[PDB]
Coordinates of C-alpha atoms in Angstrom, one line a residue:
Chain A
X1 CA -33.4 -0.2 21.3
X2 CA -31.8 3.0 20.0
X3 CA -28.4 1.9 21.2
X4 CA -28.3 -2.0 20.7
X5 CA -29.5 -4.2 17.6
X6 CA -31.6 -7.3 18.2
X7 CA -28.8 -10.0 19.1
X8 CA -27.5 -7.5 21.7
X9 CA -30.7 -5.7 22.5
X10 CA -32.7 -8.9 23.3
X11 CA -30.4 -10.0 26.3
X12 CA -31.1 -6.4 28.0
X13 CA -34.9 -6.3 26.9
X14 CA -35.2 -9.7 28.4
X15 CA -33.7 -8.6 31.6
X16 CA -36.4 -5.6 31.7
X17 CA -39.2 -8.1 30.6
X18 CA -38.2 -10.5 33.5
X19 CA -38.1 -7.8 36.1
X20 CA -41.3 -5.8 34.9
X21 CA -43.1 -9.2 34.6
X22 CA -42.2 -10.2 38.0
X23 CA -43.2 -6.6 39.2
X24 CA -46.6 -7.1 37.5
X25 CA -47.3 -10.6 38.8
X26 CA -46.3 -9.2 42.4
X27 CA -49.0 -6.4 42.0
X28 CA -51.6 -8.8 40.7
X29 CA -50.9 -11.5 43.4
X30 CA -51.3 -8.8 46.2
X31 CA -54.4 -7.2 44.6
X32 CA -56.1 -10.7 44.6
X33 CA -55.2 -11.0 48.4
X34 CA -56.7 -7.6 48.8
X35 CA -59.7 -8.5 46.8
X36 CA -60.3 -11.5 49.2
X37 CA -60.0 -9.2 52.0
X38 CA -62.4 -6.7 50.5
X39 CA -64.8 -9.6 49.6
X40 CA -64.9 -10.8 53.4
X41 CA -65.6 -7.1 54.3
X42 CA -68.4 -6.6 51.8
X43 CA -69.8 -10.0 53.0
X44 CA -69.8 -8.6 56.6
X45 CA -71.3 -5.4 55.2
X46 CA -74.1 -7.2 53.4
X47 CA -74.7 -9.2 56.6
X48 CA -75.0 -6.1 58.6
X49 CA -77.4 -4.4 56.2
Chain B
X1 CA -31.2 -32.5 24.9
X2 CA -31.2 -34.1 21.5
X3 CA -29.6 -31.1 20.0
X4 CA -27.1 -29.7 22.5
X5 CA -24.6 -31.2 25.3
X6 CA -24.5 -30.2 28.8
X7 CA -22.6 -27.0 28.8
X8 CA -24.7 -25.6 26.0
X9 CA -28.0 -27.3 27.0
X10 CA -27.8 -26.2 30.6
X11 CA -28.3 -22.6 29.6
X12 CA -31.5 -23.4 27.6
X13 CA -32.7 -25.9 30.0
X14 CA -32.4 -23.3 32.9
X15 CA -34.4 -20.8 30.7
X16 CA -37.2 -23.4 30.6
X17 CA -36.8 -24.3 34.3
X18 CA -37.2 -20.6 35.4
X19 CA -40.2 -20.2 33.3
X20 CA -42.0 -23.2 34.1
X21 CA -41.1 -22.9 37.9
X22 CA -42.5 -19.5 37.6
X23 CA -45.7 -20.9 35.9
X24 CA -46.2 -23.6 38.5
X25 CA -45.6 -21.1 41.4
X26 CA -48.1 -18.8 39.9
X27 CA -50.6 -21.7 39.7
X28 CA -50.0 -22.8 43.3
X29 CA -50.2 -19.0 44.5
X30 CA -53.6 -18.6 42.9
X31 CA -55.0 -21.8 44.1
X32 CA -53.9 -20.9 47.8
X33 CA -55.8 -17.8 47.2
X34 CA -59.1 -19.8 45.6
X35 CA -58.7 -22.2 48.6
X36 CA -59.0 -19.3 51.2
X37 CA -62.0 -18.1 49.4
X38 CA -63.6 -21.8 49.2
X39 CA -62.8 -22.1 52.8
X40 CA -64.7 -18.9 53.7
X41 CA -67.7 -20.2 51.5
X42 CA -67.5 -23.6 53.3
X43 CA -67.4 -21.7 56.6
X44 CA -70.6 -20.0 55.5
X45 CA -72.3 -23.2 54.2
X46 CA -71.3 -24.9 57.5
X47 CA -73.0 -22.0 59.4
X48 CA -76.3 -22.2 57.2
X49 CA -76.3 -26.0 58.0

């Protein structure tokens, strides 16, 4: 944004948006799977209590 | 498709395909995780039966 103006910059910003949004979606998906595993472990812990 | 012909339209259709396919893949992934949780709950319900 210091070096390019809108018509040019948007193409580059869109490449960053696409890759950063894919990075965030990957993080959230794997946190959802880890949460499901921690949920199973807490169910087991509550059953042992 | 009313406003652009193939060579121009394909770039815009591909933008929509990319984002809609990512939307539907996000939906399917989170349904897979929810289904795993509902199966853990059905396993528990069957065990309580």
